[PDB]
Design an enzyme around this catalytic site. Sequence first.
Site, PDB file in Angstrom:
ATOM      1  N   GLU A 212       0.818  -1.201   0.000  1.00 57.04           N
ATOM      2  CA  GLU A 212       0.000   0.000   0.000  1.00 57.04           C
ATOM      3  C   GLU A 212       0.852   1.252   0.000  1.00 57.04           C
ATOM      4  O   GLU A 212       1.641   1.471   0.906  1.00 57.04           O
ATOM      5  CB  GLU A 212      -0.946  -0.011   1.193  1.00 57.04           C
ATOM      6  N   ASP A 214       0.401   4.992   0.479  1.00 55.35           N
ATOM      7  CA  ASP A 214      -0.493   6.062   0.861  1.00 55.35           C
ATOM      8  C   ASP A 214       0.114   7.386   0.482  1.00 55.35           C
ATOM      9  O   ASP A 214       0.794   8.044   1.284  1.00 55.35           O
ATOM     10  CB  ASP A 214      -0.853   5.988   2.341  1.00 55.35           C
ATOM     11  N   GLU A 217      -3.223  10.826   2.765  1.00 53.07           N
ATOM     12  CA  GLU A 217      -4.274  10.599   3.741  1.00 53.07           C
ATOM     13  C   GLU A 217      -4.407  11.895   4.496  1.00 53.07           C
ATOM     14  O   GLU A 217      -3.450  12.339   5.129  1.00 53.07           O
ATOM     15  CB  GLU A 217      -3.897   9.457   4.650  1.00 53.07           C
ATOM     16  N   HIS A 228       3.711   1.393   2.906  1.00 56.02           N
ATOM     17  CA  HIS A 228       3.515   0.184   3.742  1.00 56.02           C
ATOM     18  C   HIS A 228       3.921  -1.064   2.957  1.00 56.02           C
ATOM     19  O   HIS A 228       3.166  -1.513   2.094  1.00 56.02           O
ATOM     20  CB  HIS A 228       2.034  -0.026   4.069  1.00 56.02           C
TER      21      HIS A 228
HETATM   22  O1  LIG Z   1      -6.742   5.937   3.800  1.00 57.26           O
HETATM   23  C1  LIG Z   1      -6.587   4.691   3.074  1.00 57.26           C
HETATM   24  C2  LIG Z   1      -6.426   3.527   4.054  1.00 57.26           C
HETATM   25  C3  LIG Z   1      -6.819   2.198   3.427  1.00 57.26           C
HETATM   26  O2  LIG Z   1      -6.686   1.129   4.372  1.00 57.26           O
HETATM   27  N1  LIG Z   1      -5.023   3.461   4.548  1.00 57.26           N
HETATM   28  C4  LIG Z   1      -4.913   3.095   5.990  1.00 57.26           C
HETATM   29  C5  LIG Z   1      -3.463   2.694   6.302  1.00 57.26           C
HETATM   30  O3  LIG Z   1      -3.227   1.346   5.871  1.00 57.26           O
HETATM   31  C6  LIG Z   1      -3.223   2.793   7.793  1.00 57.26           C
HETATM   32  O4  LIG Z   1      -4.376   2.248   8.390  1.00 57.26           O
HETATM   33  C7  LIG Z   1      -4.625   2.390   9.736  1.00 57.26           C
HETATM   34  C8  LIG Z   1      -3.637   2.759  10.617  1.00 57.26           C
HETATM   35  C9  LIG Z   1      -3.957   2.868  11.983  1.00 57.26           C
HETATM   36  C10 LIG Z   1      -2.948   3.195  12.872  1.00 57.26           C
HETATM   37  C11 LIG Z   1      -3.243   3.327  14.234  1.00 57.26           C
HETATM   38  C12 LIG Z   1      -4.538   3.113  14.680  1.00 57.26           C
HETATM   39  C13 LIG Z   1      -5.547   2.772  13.793  1.00 57.26           C
HETATM   40  C14 LIG Z   1      -5.276   2.661  12.426  1.00 57.26           C
HETATM   41  C15 LIG Z   1      -6.280   2.314  11.518  1.00 57.26           C
HETATM   42  C16 LIG Z   1      -7.617   2.112  11.897  1.00 57.26           C
HETATM   43  C17 LIG Z   1      -8.594   1.775  10.966  1.00 57.26           C
HETATM   44  C18 LIG Z   1      -8.250   1.625   9.628  1.00 57.26           C
HETATM   45  C19 LIG Z   1      -6.926   1.811   9.241  1.00 57.26           C
HETATM   46  C20 LIG Z   1      -5.938   2.172  10.163  1.00 57.26           C
END
Ligand SMILES: OCC(CO)NC[C@H](O)COc1cc2ccccc2c2ccccc12
Length: 434
Positions: A212, A214, A217, A228
Amino acid sequence: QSACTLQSETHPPLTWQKCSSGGTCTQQTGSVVIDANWRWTHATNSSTNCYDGNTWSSTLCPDNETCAKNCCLDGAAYASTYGVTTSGNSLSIGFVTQSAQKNVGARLYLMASDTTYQEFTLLGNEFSFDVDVSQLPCGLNGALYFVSMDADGGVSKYPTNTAGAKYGTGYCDSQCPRDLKFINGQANVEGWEPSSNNANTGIGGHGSCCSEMDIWEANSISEALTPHPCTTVGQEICEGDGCGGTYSDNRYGGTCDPDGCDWNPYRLGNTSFYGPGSSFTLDTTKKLTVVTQFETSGAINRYYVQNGVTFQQPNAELGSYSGNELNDDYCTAEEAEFGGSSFSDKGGLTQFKKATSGGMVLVMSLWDDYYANMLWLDSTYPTNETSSTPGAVRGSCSTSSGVPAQVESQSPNAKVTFSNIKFGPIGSTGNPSG
Ligand SMILES: OCC(CO)NC[C@H](O)COc1cc2ccccc2c2ccccc12
Ligand SMILES: *[C@@H]1O[C@H](CO)[C@@H](O)[C@H](O)[C@H]1NC(C)=O
Ligand SMILES: *[C@@H]1O[C@H](CO)[C@@H](O)[C@H](O)[C@H]1NC(C)=O
Ligand SMILES: [Co+2]
Ligand SMILES: [Co+2]
């Protein structure tokens, strides 16, 4: 799953520019498609739901294979159901859309044809886009990113998926998401646990992993750039808690790095770079241009343009790292100063380079966070930490912000607009659009 046609599927068109080293750009015509999870899933021969609320039909879907045989994805009314519109090179995604039911957000993929995703090879190239984040408050994430999905949405590998990219199948990312209703041409009903705080979602026994990137965001308050890596570069099923990711009780027990090597200028100390109004370098009440360059070393460079003024990614000093390039040295210093070993465990930028060397699919989304209220992006996280904990403060949003029901109720008309996508060799995307 198969495709049904009780509702027709017409992908909103979207153009973008492909630029060349010789200094010209030429228009490409694509479209966008909504991810399968947002669709109505019903019986192939009737309007009976296979999934409704956050539970599956126990008769249509007694197991993953039978479910996929019995069930289909149907078409999407992009504007009236999902708040998704396009115009030329612009895409807008609304937050809450009220039709016969309430919809929250969308996850969209750029297509090459009505049945195939557009691939981009990021390495050696750069990606530019314009964004208006002015209507995104704390707790929301308007995201533009890349994932190592199959161009067909998985059909060639999993023939029981006949719906394909046309219906937004095949998603994966570095969270190894387990909330997907279909993975690898099978449903995800086995092991399904309905979410305790979301009437529409749950978590299944399988997840879908891949690399991934990003690129963006962000909301009007915070923004981050985060690669990632995963130990398997492309789309790969995972089993239960072995998945890792935010959908599992252990986030680090898997093949992907769910944290990433994030570059958030606020988190790194420049709290004046990005935010609403004239007190910030970049004024998030106004459209801005974001350019991201993937040099062949595997490092990532970034600059921004607003009202004709250019800013490189601001300089940061972290341990013995100093600079504005997201490189090995940055990511290592980040782990050393802020903590963690996920990014490096999964092979860092060297492993990530395997993803950007290959094809990736462009994703544009708007979402709120039912697991952590987006605090990891725009607040202090974990919320018991203070500014004395290195890296804990990622933005100025209250640690009480981003409760999904609250932001859905208070900010339903929030939206993100992405526009003027340009892609080509490093140095090429600032040249005139064709
Ligand atoms: O904005 C696009 C998204 C697609 O998955 N990218 C997220 C991308 O991988 C980091 O994701 C997260 C990272 C994260 C880090 C600490 C706490 C919670 C989270 C979290 C909670 C719900 C969903 C995702 C996360
Ligand atoms: C933040 O970044 C901008 C752009 O590089 C720079 O001009 C400004 O002086 C920086 N401020 C701080 C506090 O680091
Ligand atoms: C915050 O909570 C976590 C887990 O309970 C703990 O490890 C950490 O030390 C706490 N930090 C502070 C500032 O109390
Ligand atoms: Co299994
Ligand atoms: Co360099």
